[PDB]
C-alpha cells in the first residue's frame, strides 16, 4: 500500500524534475527526492584553532569556512544515519527537528 | 435490588420511571442492565453465534470466544451484544448484559392500509456494518419475515411480522450482518414521516422532575 | 455519471456494450462458441458409451495416498480416448 | 522469474518460433 502521500519525493505539478547524483555512491536520483544537507564547516577543525592562531601572521584573521551542499540517495542517507526510519505517525512530521 | 449508582437507576428502582419509552424519549443512557431487567421483564435472549478468535503469542495461540447475543421481546424492543471472553458461559452472560444495555425501539408500521395493529415496518430502512448492507422493505400481511435465519430471529425478537430483506456484501460475516440489521431497525424512528411533522411541546425530563428521588445523599 | 450512458436514445450503445461484455462470462462464451460440440469428448451428451482399453491405477494428489483404479476408454460415438474412474470398493474387478 | 525477464524469455522464444516457420515458408 501507499506509504506516503508525497510519495517519497516533492513533485506536485512537474512530471519530471532532473536527476542529481548521490555524493557517496553516485546513484542517479531526482533532485526533489534526493536528500539534501548543508555542510557548513570551519576550514580547519575545532582543536587547531589555537594552533592556527598561534602560527598566524595577520592576528585574528578570519577563520574561513567551507560550504558544501551534499546530495544523498535514500539508501546512503539511511545507512549514514541522516534520516533514520521513523514510526508511522511520526513520519508525517516535516520539521527540521 | 442492588441500591445502585446512576441516578436513572435510583429513579427506576424507586419506581419513578415504570416505562422504557420514557428513557427512549429522553435519550437517557442506560449503564445498568437491571434498569432494562425491571422495565422490560419479559425479555428473551438468544445466542446467535459463538466463534473462536485467536491471538498469536511467543509460543501458542491464545483462544477466546466471541458470543453474539440478541435480546428482545416481540413488542418492539431488541438489543444486540457482542462479547469476547476466555470461556463461553462468561461470553454468553456478559453478551446478555451488553445486549440488554443496547435495547432500542423499532417503529412498526403498515405496508399500507391502516387497519389495526401494525405488522410491518413504516419505511424502507438500511443499515451498514463492514461491507454488509441490510435493507428492510415493508411487506404485506402474511408475507412473513423474508430474511436469512439470523436476521429472521432478530426481527422475530423485535416483533416484526412482515418484512422483505435485501442484503449486500459478505453476509457470512454474521456479526456485521446482525449489526447492519440492528442499525437498519434503529433507523426506523430515525426517519421523519409526515405523521411526525406536528411539533410537540418537548416534555421535561424525569431527571429534572424527580431530581431528589435521584441523587442519593 | 457512473460511466455508462444514461440518455433516452442510448439504447444502442447500452445493448452493444452489454453484448461485448457478455463474452467475459464462462457459460455464455462456452454456449455461444459451441465448445461442447467441438471440445468436450461427451459431445454435448450427458452420457457416452465406450470400450475399455486398459485398467489404470492413478496415484492420487497430495496429501492423499491412494491408487484410484480408473479405466482408459475409447468412445464409440466419437473415437476420443478418455479416462474414467470406477466408483466403489472393488468394481474394477467388475469391468473387464 | 521477475516478470520483466519472463517477458524477455518470451521474446527469445517468439523469435525462434517465427524463425522456424520462415524455415518452412
Amino acid at each position: 500500500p501507499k506509504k506516503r502521500a508525497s510519495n517519497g519525493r516533492n513533485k506536485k505539478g512537474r512530471g519530471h524534475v532532473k536527476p542529481v547524483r548521490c555524493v557517496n555512491c553516485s546513484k542517479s536520483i531526482p533532485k526533489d527526492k534526493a536528500i539534501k544537507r548543508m555542510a557548513i564547516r570551519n576550514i580547519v577543525e575545532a582543536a587547531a584553532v589555537r594552533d592556527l592562531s598561534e602560527a598566524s601572521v595577520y592576528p585574528e584573521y578570519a577563520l574561513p569556512k567551507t560550504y558544501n551542499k551534499l546530495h544523498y540517495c535514500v539508501s546512503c542517507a539511511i545507512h549514514a544515519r541522516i534520516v533514520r526510519v521513523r514510526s508511522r505517525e511520526d513520519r508525517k512530521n516535516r520539521a527540521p527537528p | 435490588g442492588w441500591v445502585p449508582v446512576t441516578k436513572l437507576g435510583r429513579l427506576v428502582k424507586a419506581g419513578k420511571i415504570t416505562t422504557i419509552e420514557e428513557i427512549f424519549l429522553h435519550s437517557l443512557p442506560v449503564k445498568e442492565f437491571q434498569i432494562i431487567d425491571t422495565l422490560l421483564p419479559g425479555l428473551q435472549d438468544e445466542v446467535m453465534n459463538i466463534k473462536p478468535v485467536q491471538k498469536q503469542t511467543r509460543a501458542g495461540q491464545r483462544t477466546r470466544f466471541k458470543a453474539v447475543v440478541v435480546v428482545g421481546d416481540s413488542n418492539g424492543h431488541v438489543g444486540l451484544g457482542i462479547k469476547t471472553a476466555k470461556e463461553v458461559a462468561g461470553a454468553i452472560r456478559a453478551g446478555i448484559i451488553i445486549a440488554k444495555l443496547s435495547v432500542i425501539p423499532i417503529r412498526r408500521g403498515y405496508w399500507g392500509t391502516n387497519l389495526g395493529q401494525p405488522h410491518s415496518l413504516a419505511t424502507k430502512t438500511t443499515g451498514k456494518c463492514g461491507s454488509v448492507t441490510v435493507r428492510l422493505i415493508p411487506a404485506p400481511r402474511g408475507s412473513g419475515i423474508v430474511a436469512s435465519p439470523a436476521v429472521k430471529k432478530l426481527l422475530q425478537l423485535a416483533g416484526v411480522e412482515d418484512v422483505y430483506t435485501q442484503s449486500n456484501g459478505k453476509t457470512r460475516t454474521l456479526e456485521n450482518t446482525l449489526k447492519a440489521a440492528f442499525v437498519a431497525i434503529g433507523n426506523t424512528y430515525g426517519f421523519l414521516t409526515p405523521n411526525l411533522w406536528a411539533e410537540q411541546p418537548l416534555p421535561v425530563s424525569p431527571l429534572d422532575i424527580y431530581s431528589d428521588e435521584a441523587s442519593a445523599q | 455519471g457512473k460511466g455508462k450512458p444514461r440518455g433516452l436514445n442510448s439504447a444502442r450503445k447500452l445493448r452493444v456494450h452489454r453484448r461485448n461484455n457478455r463474452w467475459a462470462e464462462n457459460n455464455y462464451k462456452k454456449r455461444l462458441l459451441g465448445t461442447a460440440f467441438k471440445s468436450s469428448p461427451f459431445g454435448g451428451s450427458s452420457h457416452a458409451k465406450g470400450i475399455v482399453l486398459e485398467k489404470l491405477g492413478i496415484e492420487s494428489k497430495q496429501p492423499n495416498s491412494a491408487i484410484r483404479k480408473c479405466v482408459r476408454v475409447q468412445l464409440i460415438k466419437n473415437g476420443k480416448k478418455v479416462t474414467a474412474f470406477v466408483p466403489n470398493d472393488g468394481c474394477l474387478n467388475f469391468v473387464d | 522469474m521477475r516478470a520483466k525477464w519472463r517477458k524477455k524469455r518470451t521474446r527469445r522464444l517468439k523469435r525462434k518460433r517465427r524463425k522456424v516457420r520462415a524455415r518452412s515458408k
Binding site: - | 419509552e21 428513557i23 427512549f24 424519549l25 429522553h26 435519550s27 443512557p29 413488542n75 418492539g76 432500542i104 425501539p105 417503529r107 408500521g109 403498515y110 391502516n114 387497519l115 389495526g116 395493529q117 401494525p118 413504516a122 434503529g186 424512528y189 430515525g190 426517519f191 421523519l192 414521516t193 405523521n195 411526525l196 411539533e199 410537540q200 418537548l202 421535561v204 425530563s205 429534572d208 | - | -
Partner: protein
C-alpha cells in the same frame, strides 16, 4: 401513527431538534435538552418553569449549536441583540 379505529399506536413520539427538526432518537447521546429558567419580577428564577430547547448531536458535533441556541433564545425573547439574521 394511528390505526383505523382511533388508537394511536406508537411505542412514543420522539423529540425533534429545536434547531433542525431532525428526530432525536434513543441512541443519540450527544443530543441535549437545555432548560432556561423563567424569571419573574425582581429577578428570581421560578423553580419549576423553563423555556426548553432540544439540540441534536448532529448540530452539537458540527459546532452550530451555539448559534442555533442564540437564534432560538432571541426568537423566544431570552436574548435581545446577540443574533442577526443577515450574517
Amino acid at each position: 401513527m394511528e390505526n383505523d379505529k382511533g388508537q394511536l399506536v406508537e411505542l412514543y413520539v420522539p423529540r425533534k431538534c429545536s434547531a433542525t427538526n431532525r428526530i432525536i432518537k434513543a441512541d443519540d447521546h450527544a443530543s441535549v435538552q437545555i432548560n432556561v429558567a423563567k424569571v419573574d419580577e425582581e429577578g428570581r428564577a421560578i423553580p419549576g418553569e423553563y423555556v426548553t430547547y432540544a439540540l441534536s448531536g448532529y448540530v452539537r458535533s458540527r459546532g452550530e449549536s451555539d448559534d442555533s441556541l442564540n437564534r432560538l433564545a432571541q426568537n423566544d425573547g431570552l436574548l435581545k441583540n446577540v443574533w442577526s439574521y443577515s450574517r
